[PDB]
């Protein structure tokens, strides 16, 4: 309730970690120049891109 646990700081830490992760993802997308670097980014579209690259 008072000392042993400070829940506001925990919530703030969570949100801070999430924001840092999102900024890191954006940095990856900007440095790479591609919007899809992993399949977790977009599954339907990775396959399409690979087939289109083969066709090109």
């Amino acid at each position: 309730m008072r000392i042993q646990h400070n829940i506001a700081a925990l919530n703030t830490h969570r949100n801070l970690a999430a924001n840092n992760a999102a900024a890191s993802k954006n940095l990856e997308k900007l440095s790479s120049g591609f919007k899809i670097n992993r399949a977790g980014d977009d599954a339907a579209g990775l396959a399409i891109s690979e087939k289109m690259r083969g066709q090109i």
Binding site: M1, R2, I3, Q4, H5, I7, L10, N11, R14
Partner: protein, 55 residues
């Protein structure tokens, strides 16, 4: 993460103590202790009827 924070809040509210309430209680109990000390110091002096006997 959400569940851990919520259960941490619950456990804190269950087991941890509020400093202000315990401070209040501790000050109250100290004041009562001092009062009882003075009362006992008086009660020990109350039975003095030696002036009945001697003079």
């Amino acid at each position: 993460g959400t569940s851990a924070e919520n259960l941490t809040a619950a456990e804190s509210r269950i087991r941890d103590t509020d400093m202000a309430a315990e401070m209040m209680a501790f000050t109250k109990n100290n004041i009562l202790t001092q009062a009882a000390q003075s009362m006992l110091a008086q009660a020990n002096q109350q039975p003095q009827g030696v002036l009945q006997l001697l003079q």
